[PDB]
Ligand binder design. Sequence first.
Ligand SMILES: Nc1nc2c(ncn2[C@@H]2O[C@H](COP(=O)(O)OP(=O)(O)OP(=O)(O)O)[C@@H](O)[C@H]2O)c(=O)[nH]1
Ligand SMILES: Nc1ncnc2c1ncn2[C@@H]1O[C@H](COP(=O)(O)OP(=O)(O)CP(=O)(O)O)[C@@H](O)[C@H]1O
Ligand SMILES: Nc1nc2c(ncn2[C@@H]2O[C@H](COP(=O)(O)OP(=O)(O)O)[C@@H](O)[C@H]2O)c(=O)[nH]1
Ligand SMILES: Cc1nnc(N2CCCCC2)s1
Ligand SMILES: Cc1nnc(N2CCCCC2)s1
Ligand SMILES: [Ca+2]
Ligand SMILES: [Ca+2]
Ligand SMILES: [Ca+2]
Ligand SMILES: [Mg+2]
Ligand SMILES: [Mg+2]
Ligand SMILES: [Mg+2]
Lengths: 425, 352, 54, 438
Amino acid sequence: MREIVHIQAGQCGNQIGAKFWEVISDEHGIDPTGSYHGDSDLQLERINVYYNEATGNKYVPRAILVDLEPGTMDSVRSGPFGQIFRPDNFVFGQSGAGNNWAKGHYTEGAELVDSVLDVVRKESESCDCLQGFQLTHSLGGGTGSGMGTLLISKIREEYPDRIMNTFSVMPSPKVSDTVVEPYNATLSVHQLVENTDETYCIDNEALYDICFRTLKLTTPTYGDLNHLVSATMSGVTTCLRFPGQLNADLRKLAVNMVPFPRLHFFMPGFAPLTSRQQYRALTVPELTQQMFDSKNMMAACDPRHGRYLTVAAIFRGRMSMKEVDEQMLNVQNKNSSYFVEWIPNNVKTAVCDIPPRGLKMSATFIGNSTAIQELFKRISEQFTAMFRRKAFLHWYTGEGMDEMEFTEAESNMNDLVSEYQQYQD
Amino acid sequence: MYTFVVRDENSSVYAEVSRLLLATGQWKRLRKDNPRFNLMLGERNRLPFGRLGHEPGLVQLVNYYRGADKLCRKASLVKLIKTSPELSESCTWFPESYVIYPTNLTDEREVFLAAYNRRREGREGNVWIAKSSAGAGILISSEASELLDFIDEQGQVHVIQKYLEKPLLLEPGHRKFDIRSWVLVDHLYNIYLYREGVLRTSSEPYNSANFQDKTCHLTNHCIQKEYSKNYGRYEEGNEMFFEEFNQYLMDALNTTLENSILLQIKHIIRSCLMCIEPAISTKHLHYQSFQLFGFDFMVDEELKVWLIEVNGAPACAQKLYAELCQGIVDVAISSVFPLAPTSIFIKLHHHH
Amino acid sequence: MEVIELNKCTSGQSFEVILKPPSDPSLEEIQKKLEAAEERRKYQEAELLKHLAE
Amino acid sequence: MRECISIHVGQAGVQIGNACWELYCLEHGIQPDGQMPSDKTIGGGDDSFNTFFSETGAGKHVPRAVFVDLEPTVIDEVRTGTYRQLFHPEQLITGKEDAANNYARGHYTIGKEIIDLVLDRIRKLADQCTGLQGFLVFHSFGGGTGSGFTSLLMERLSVDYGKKSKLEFSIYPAPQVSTAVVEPYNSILTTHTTLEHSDCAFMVDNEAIYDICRRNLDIERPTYTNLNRLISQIVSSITASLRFDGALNVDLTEFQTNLVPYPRIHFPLATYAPVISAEKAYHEQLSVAEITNACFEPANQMVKCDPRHGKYMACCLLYRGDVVPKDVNAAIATIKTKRSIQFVDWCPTGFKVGINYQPPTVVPGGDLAKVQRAVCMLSNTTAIAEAWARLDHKFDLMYAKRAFVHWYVGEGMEEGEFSEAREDMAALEKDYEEVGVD
Ligand SMILES: Nc1nc2c(ncn2[C@@H]2O[C@H](COP(=O)(O)OP(=O)(O)OP(=O)(O)O)[C@@H](O)[C@H]2O)c(=O)[nH]1
Ligand SMILES: Nc1ncnc2c1ncn2[C@@H]1O[C@H](COP(=O)(O)OP(=O)(O)CP(=O)(O)O)[C@@H](O)[C@H]1O
Ligand SMILES: Nc1nc2c(ncn2[C@@H]2O[C@H](COP(=O)(O)OP(=O)(O)O)[C@@H](O)[C@H]2O)c(=O)[nH]1
Ligand SMILES: Cc1nnc(N2CCCCC2)s1
Ligand SMILES: Cc1nnc(N2CCCCC2)s1
Ligand SMILES: [Ca+2]
Ligand SMILES: [Ca+2]
Ligand SMILES: [Ca+2]
Ligand SMILES: [Mg+2]
Ligand SMILES: [Mg+2]
Ligand SMILES: [Mg+2]
């Protein structure tokens, strides 16, 4: 009974979080009312990992919904599966965070954090043996970014020896809400370097390009982007939610994926990604070629610009496990210049029989590549472009921050980049 | 797309094989420490064989037979010939040899002196040559006292073998020589003999009344090109190829190279390699091996062939690099990693 | 090629063939090791909480 | 009659242990409910099989085993499995969360908190023994529990049972079968702290079992069940002398006496034959010489290496089935004239031989076909040092960058224990080279 407590904060956090629960609930057979209507025991074997069991054979997600304004969560509560969440697990304010990291982290957020921790404590107290936490949020706004990382710091203070993982949506000028996104992202990245064991970096620019170029969507919406994140989140947690010869909790996964404590920012990937020629069967060779193609990866980083420290791939569906090994060993042994040679056997593959909804088979890619430094370089560049002129800084000094804190975040992230650069050589 | 690594930057041969592999556009070279490779061009000493054939999904090939040193070491070859029933001590094509350890260190010192006294008393020619693998350090002498004292002044194992006092002398010139043959053994253990050999001749007249000057007795390419004063007079680089050496034997001795010499050379290659096959074969091993060998022979005035030594990391004649190196890639490398004639080799068939 | 020490019973037998003749830490010290590592975990956790308290 | 307590640590040890006791029961005719008809002494007796099974007044034959795992999912398969009736609850010990493939976690952090509970449960089995010989400890090298908690158990077992012998069955990590990146660290850490506490250890390289399962049994992608049943046959061959009437390897002390002249060099190489797929219509039953010749083919070794390029220090031939001494010696003579058997000058060139007339038992519906005779060779070769070299090299690659080291330090381990353990493996590698090379 290795439970995971899920937390989703802010607009992005809750909309991506909502679709995540919508997807896995479907895979586990839970309907919008929380009643199980599946047909296989495999759907219930590891069901307690993400769901609590109430009276009458009901299943309630172990999810805490946090936000500083009521809008997004009011939409979730009225959404498809909105009825399935514990009413007490909605923690929200009314002021909002105005896309301001300082407001979510120091002022508006500080006022609300204790009641969120009150709900986390309540969910953890009922866990037979807490694996750890996972948080969905964006880094470019105010609540998910500023208050999200405040929550991580206070969760760590209270549960220091538990695993803390995040799915973090990185900002991009191409898919931007406000110009202060580099400020909020750089401030958040410093918190994450210290206080998370694994952070899946989801670049809104990569999500957009995939919807536009690969999926052939003329005008992608946030919903379209969130469909991709839902599918990816379901894929990375497949080995936690379904039975198999894996027998690995969050800590064992982290131990084997993170060779250095600060270099724990992952590039996720999914396959297939087909436009609507969608019923065609996808061969294992096609799954492997796509899953390793940059155009299928969601960090907007070209893996050929760096080297993989570690790689993990989950295959879902009824396929030839012999053919899976042949193709995976065919990709490494045909691009060995992009894997570090000083970590023996740093590519691990798993297979799961249960495929996602409406897919004969799929592949989810989890890569710890030094090419992720390109993502932090872009953020650092945009940050400095404004900070050198102190542009838009008054929004943050008015919340009690000093310029010194900005200088430090800058250095911390440039250090992170320099740290990636030296392991790539 | 096949990958290989290079771990011997001093191999003239495989430096060309590596150059050809890349030219095919179907082989890729990796760093010398990358374990994900198909072919290893390994180092000469302490090649980590134990780390081959454990990479999932990789067929790994190496250009050295683990255990072939038994054949390519002076004192090892002597012990192998005397203790191998396939070869016996009555081996008719290997000069009488003994393993002699310096007195500062089994050993065959007393056994050597026994046969030595027999020759001295029997009026027979009793000239021996002392040598060791630690040589560029050779001593040819007719007195046993000098041979043993030369070994004690050193500190490594030596071998004393009979000096062929009646070597076949080429004419004109009255000069010694030796025959180098290159032999390729592939993963299946087919024994291929390169159709092209070389004679490394001595540019000096053979003088049997003065072993002091080691220029007319040692036919090495370095000694002839450093101390001999008539280097390159009769043949360019003191190297005569089979076509010329064959026409000479027809005009001089009314015999051919095949009948008079090559039958014995092929017999000696088969005997040595078949002997150690059970000990070094990779047929049932987790990796595959091949190796190029340099056999060095002597020919006496009776047209009998003698085995001198076997070189495990041999060089090649400048003129024969292209053809031989291509032959390696054809039968040794591509035979296991095929790419998207009239063979240059002579398959010495045998039973495995 | 000699056989020696031939032992026979209802369920089998065993013998020997010769082809050629021939030519700790105390219970206390372990407790210290265990507690030494535990103390280093306490120190590291003290620094983490001191860092978070800052 | 002297007893042997089996200890299974971590996932690999527990699952392998599960497949051994299944085989033990089929070999001694013990039903899943623990009953044994042929045992005419109810609730008592000092027979050969009593070294591994105690008896209740109600006629139940209970294994003398302890299952330990820091996480409960694997041992819960035993609690509800076919043989759930054999063990009583006190014999199955499970924690809450595992060692996460972290040696320091299984040895220090978690090991410290459960060690006294395991020792107590082991004392319970010891208190039923009128003359305990020692312990058989099954574990993996790569697992955080199998490596980390085992080494601590071996340190304490030496304290509480000084005069007792301790044998290991260790699973050597291989990337074919499921493996992690940090397993080379755990392998060397555990071999260092366990070395001076193990009298004799049989390493099974998962790569070897994987290849034998694909080549002989024709299994496309073998599972743990395929691997474990194959491994238990070898374990059964090695422990049969302790459970059956015989004269060779009759107690654990005899394993060190026959296979280990130098204490540190206590890793005999195991070879087994024949392994015949049961799916085969009908195989030609191999002869004594043929299966004896197979013991010198690398393809049937438990650890992939080349014995032709080492030196033998000892050698045991354990036959099961229709085998008589005449056939053995006839085959041995034939092999000395063919193979490359290089013995060390300070060790007799001989073979201790054991024959058990009962042929190998095979789990019904398993992958192994019934054969009329099989042999397991236990030979102490310097050639097995290749496995230490391979593993030591993977350790060096990662440790040069200090990769993953922070995970161990975070659990209270000092970084110095890494280099101290690696320098011990360097000394171990030199010991083999002094015994083999010239
Ligand atoms: N042959 C065989 N190997 C196994 C088996 N189970 C696990 N392994 C091997 O053991 C290694 C992993 O260690 P585990 O035994 O699973 O880990 P553990 O001892 O339970 O310790 P934890 O880290 O706490 O889980 C891998 O190299 C596996 O190949 C098994 O049933 N049979
Ligand atoms: N018993 C013998 N009788 C006649 N000549 C001999 C001999 N032993 C050695 N030689 C001479 O010495 C030369 C070969 O020396 P050797 O091969 O032992 O040294 P080496 O190994 O450093 C040269 P390489 O390995 O390059 O062929 C030959 O040219 C031969 O003429
Ligand atoms: N992928 C995705 N990104 C979003 C979504 N909503 C907002 N974002 C991104 O997140 C950032 C805005 O932060 P937001 O979550 O709205 O701020 P918060 O509500 O204060 O936490 C910008 O970079 C947006 O591009 C969404 O639904 N999906
Ligand atoms: C979250 C996860 N991080 N790693 C994972 N894998 C371990 C290796 C096999 C595939 C699954 S799942
Ligand atoms: C059990 C395991 N859980 N995770 C694993 N890996 C993740 C990918 C890199 C190597 C290790 S093995
Ligand atoms: Ca307020
Ligand atoms: Ca009884
Ligand atoms: Ca002891
Ligand atoms: Mg917003
Ligand atoms: Mg030489
Ligand atoms: Mg485990």
